[model samples]
Each structure stands twice: as C-alpha cells, then as structure tokens.
Target: LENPPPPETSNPNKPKRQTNQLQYLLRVVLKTLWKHQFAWPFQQPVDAVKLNLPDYYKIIKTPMDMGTIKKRLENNYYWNAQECIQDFNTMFTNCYIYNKPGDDIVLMAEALEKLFLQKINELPTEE
Candidate 1:
C-alpha cells in the first residue's frame, strides 16, 4: 500500500470511510426537503404533539437544533479510549451531531475499533 488506496466508489455493499460522509449526504437531502416536510412528517417524528398543533401555534414548533443535538451526542464522557468507545456510539464530528441517512451504530463501532486497535498496536510492548 504505497499510496493511499483510492476512494471507494459508492456501492450498496460498501462501508463509508467515516460517519461524516453520511452526515453530509443527509444534510443536503434534509435541506431540500425540510421546508416542505415541515407541514409533513418524518416516519419517526421527533415531536408529534407540537407538529400537530394548529398553524397559530407557530411558537410551538419543535425544530431540530444542531447545538442541542451536538450536546446530546456528547452526553457521556469516558476515562479511557476503550470506554470512549464502549459507552458512546454518538457522532464523532463536532459538525453539530447531525446523523447521516446511512449511519449505523455497528458500522461506526467497526471503524472506530479498527482505528483504536491500530493505535494500540503502535505502543511499545512490555517484556
């Protein structure tokens, strides 16, 4: 592996290089659909009661906030690298904790585990 491997072409079977890639895709699609989707609903609505409220209840809007979501993702901290992984499956990017459409906790786990083990392998072994 002299040069970095070429970027993988998107295939239904492939995993992403990082979670952020998925986040970027979701962001684009969400931005396009969000305005019109306001009156509509995601299958998994974040809040139902507020969305069902009449148009007069504009102040009752339950919009998603990046800052809030970011804080939510960082909900727990860890004492060690392993703990940082075991306890948290949250997005790693500080780009506001936006989840991508293809984001899967298991996929995130596999990628992080490989990276972490690589770092561990670089450590000086004890006699």
Candidate 2:
C-alpha cells in the first residue's frame, strides 16, 4: 500500500518545545531535582557521560554516588568505571518503574528533598 504523509508546519507564536500541562509540570519538578542532585563536590569527580543530551535526559539522569558506590569498589575491585557507568545508565532506564505520581511521587520527592536540604545544611560551608 502507498500513502502520502502529512506535511509539517511551525507556528511562530507557539513554543518550539510545546508540550502538555503535565509534561511541563514534570519538567519543572525535574529542574528542581537537578539543582539538588549536584549540590556538593566542587568538580563532581564522576565524569563519564556524553556531552550531548537533552534536559529530560539529565532530569532522570543519575550521577555516580562517589561516596558509597566507591566504597563498594574496594571490596569488589573487579568492578571498574564501566560498571559505575553501567549502573548510572541503568538507574535512568529503570526510572519509569519508580516514576509514580499522585501522593506517591509527592511523598517520595518531599522526603527526598527534605533529606537533601538536611544533607546540604550539614555540609561544612566555606567562608
């Protein structure tokens, strides 16, 4: 069967990144999450990621937990940077299973955010 495809058009007034209301809200929440995720570490010692990626990628993106994740490497030296990178990759790939809305996401994000603030407050700030 042969069929012609529809033509595409752009609206100057409309946003190039047009999306639904919920998608916008999700983006906002993700933005805040990013701000909190990279709060510490002057250089973020973990650096094994692609340079070109979208905002949503960073939104669900998980960074290396240099603290605990590294500690485990000591006992399991067989693991290498590839493993860490793999783990980080899997975290996002599996994020959908944990992406719950309603009171669930609310409660989880609330607890995690509050805990994040606490962690930030606990940091020894440099004058």
Candidate 3:
C-alpha cells in the first residue's frame, strides 16, 4: 500500500486522443457547411433550410420521406434545436457504425443532405 503512483505528463495531443473521430468528422462537416450558411441542418425553418444552406442538406433528406421525418419529430422528439442535432447524430452514427474505408462518410453526408432536401421539397412553396 505504500507504492508511489506514476506521474502523468501534460500533453497537447491528449485532448485530441480523447475526442471521438465520428464526432470530430461530423463537426467538421457541420463547420464546413456553416462557413457558407449560418444555421445547422434543420435548425432553421423547414422551408428556409433547403433554400439557404449548401448542397449538404440535400444528401441527408433525399432518402427520407417527409412522412417519416415529420412523424419522428411529432412522435419521438420535440421541436427544438437539439432535436436537429439528435437526428443528425443518429443518422451519422448509424452510417458510421458499418462504414468501411471512410468512403461511406461521404455517402452518408450526401445522403443525409438529400434527406433534408426532400423534407423541404415535400413542403408547399411559399406564397
């Protein structure tokens, strides 16, 4: 019980080591999109998001049906900014789980973008 504990050294790279790769890449994807658009995916008005954001949104929304998206929102989650984050996280995590060679990251990103696009496209145009 008298053994001395090993001293730990402060390393700059320690923080990066603690970070999640999926989370990091996802954040980068969001950051790249944010550079051009002010808001995150689906955070803005459902209609306005597609019009204002980059092509990324189209990939996310293309495969998803509006019925499913709206239903999930109405049934599973609340109408808040975090809901947007949760949806994106869920979609990205599922894709990342089976992804190989990092190629599917782009596929997932583009798919998710299209999914969002479809959501807006399904909406009635502004009067």
Candidate 4:
C-alpha cells in the first residue's frame, strides 16, 4: 500500500464564514434600529458638559450609544448576538436612568427598546 497521505489541515476559513453570516444578520437588525424615529437621542453619547448636566457622567457609569455599537459591530468587537443586544439595552437603560420618567427622551428610549426586542425576536432561533 502507498504511504498514508499527510493529515488534512483543518479548513481555517470555515468558522470565519459562519461568523460573517451572523455578522450580516446582526448588522441588518442594527440598521433597522438606527432608522427608527425614536432613535435620535440615543444615536450619540450624552454630552455632559455641553448639556450643562455636570452630574451626568457620575450618574451613568458606562455610557452606551448606537454610534458606539455600530462601530464595535463593524470592528467585530462583539462575540455574539447577546453582547450586541446588551449594548443596545445599556444605551436605552442609561436614557431611562438619566432622564425623567415622563420626559420625551425617556419615552423615546422605551419605544426604541420595544422595537429592538421585536426585531430580535424575529431572528431565527439558535441551533
């Protein structure tokens, strides 16, 4: 018999191909959220000094925003769908904490969160 063939090297591109598909799906959901009407205030980080809310930084320890999330997503910083969703939740929660419950911004946050949940639910269940 001929000498045994060399062991097959694992296909390095296989895992990355799967990751790209997941990334595309998540990016689509994020784009939908970005286009929502209530997405304005949460699109960018809060400006504590410019807004004259000196205590804003103290109150919200970890500020999150759509812009930051988008950047992280594009850079492949998130390991899974849950991590990305958590960032969106953090952004909305921060709005709730820093603004009055009845304030328009807070209301927007609530609406956005509702929409986000709906979109995520529509995603295909994990295998």
Q: Candidates 1 and 4: which is better by TM-score?
A: 4
> Considering TM-score, which of the candidate structures 1 and 2 is the better prediction for this target?
2
TM-score of 3: 0.28
In terms of TM-score, how similar is model 1 to the real structure? Answer: 0.20
What does the lDDT read for residue 58 in candidate 2?
Answer: 41
Writing each residue's lDDT as its tens digit, candidate 4 over 99-118 gives: 88989888888888887888
lDDT of 3 by residue, 53-104 (tens): 3433434342222223343333423334344445555554534443444574
- Rank candidates, TM-score, best first: 4, 3, 2, 1
Using lDDT as the measure, the top candidate is 4
Judge candidate 2 against the unseen true structure and give its global Cα lDDT, from 0 to 1.
0.34
lDDT of 2 at 85: 35
TM-score of 4: 0.77
| Candidate with best TM-score | 4
The RMSD (Cα, Å) of candidate 3 is 19.9
**Candidate 1 clash figure, as a count:** 0
lDDT of each: 0.31, 0.34, 0.38, 0.70
Estimate, for each residue in 5-64, the C-alpha lDDT of model 2 and write its tens digit: 211222345333323322322233323444554433311222224322233234433433
TM-scores vs. true structure, each candidate: 0.20, 0.24, 0.28, 0.77
